[PDB]
Amino acid sequence: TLDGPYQPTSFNPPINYWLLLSPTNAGVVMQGTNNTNRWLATLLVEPNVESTTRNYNLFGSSVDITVENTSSDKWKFIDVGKTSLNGSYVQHGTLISSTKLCAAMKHGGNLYTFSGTTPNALPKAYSTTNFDSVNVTTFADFYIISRDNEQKCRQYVNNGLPPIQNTRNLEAP
């Protein structure tokens, strides 16, 4: 099989697969909803950004969100979510990254993303509801890595993608 890259698209991902996103610049990286109780997204903020209100298109709506990135050297991924149609988005996990990669996976009713600071970012679970039916729309090129190969996803998120598009076969010893 071919891990990627795949171009921005919308689909409902199966459980037990990581989607590894490779955005180029700040903005919305990906979003997903179950159309019932969760509307979710990951935002990207470049280094060296003082607290500022930015506009993001989430599910077609114009949403103003106050963001900051105090890191001089690393990019900041921000997980955001709301739990009702008219609810406010709030910021949850963050991933402070030199690689500009983030990732999400549905497993066991939970939604996992990477959080922390590279090269020591780790998967962490959101478990406030059953997330199994949440779809995705990606706004960056992305790769698909099975949970059985989670070690490969961890290594890429923390250390970078290979310089060529052969991820199926490229892994550190």
Residue numbers in the entry: 64 to 236
Task: Reproduce the article's own wording on this structure.
The P genotypes are further classified into five genogroups, P[I] to P[V], based on the sequences of the spike protein VP8*, one of the two proteolytic fragments of VP4. It has been found that almost all P genotype RVs in P[II], P[III] and P[IV] groups that commonly infect humans recognize histo-blood group antigens (HBGAs) of the host through VP8* in a genotype dependent manner. In the present study, using a multiphasic approach, including X-ray crystallography, glycan microarray with a dedicated probe library, bio-layer interferometry, site-specific mutagenesis, and molecular docking and dynamics simulations, we found that P-VP8* can bind to all blood group A, B and H(O) antigens but on type 1 chain only, without the capability to bind to any Lewis epitopes or mucin O-glycan cores.
To investigate the structural features of P-VP8*, a recombinant P-VP8* variant (62–232 amino acids) was expressed in E. coli and purified by affinity chromatography with GSH-agarose. The N-terminal GST tag was removed by thrombin cleavage to obtain a purified protein with the molecular weight of ~19 kDa. P-VP8* showed the typical galectin-like fold with two twisted β-sheets consisting of strands A, L, C, D, G, H and M, B, I, J, K, respectively. According to the structural superimposition, P-VP8* most closely resembles the P-VP8*, with a RMSD value of 0.442 Å; it also resembles P - and P-VP8* with RMSD values of 0.483 Å and 0.532 Å, respectively. The RMSD values partly reflect the similarity of the structures although do not have absolute correlation with the phylogenetic analysis of the sequences. Here, it is shown that the structural differences between P-VP8* and P are more pronounced than those of P - and P-VP8*s.
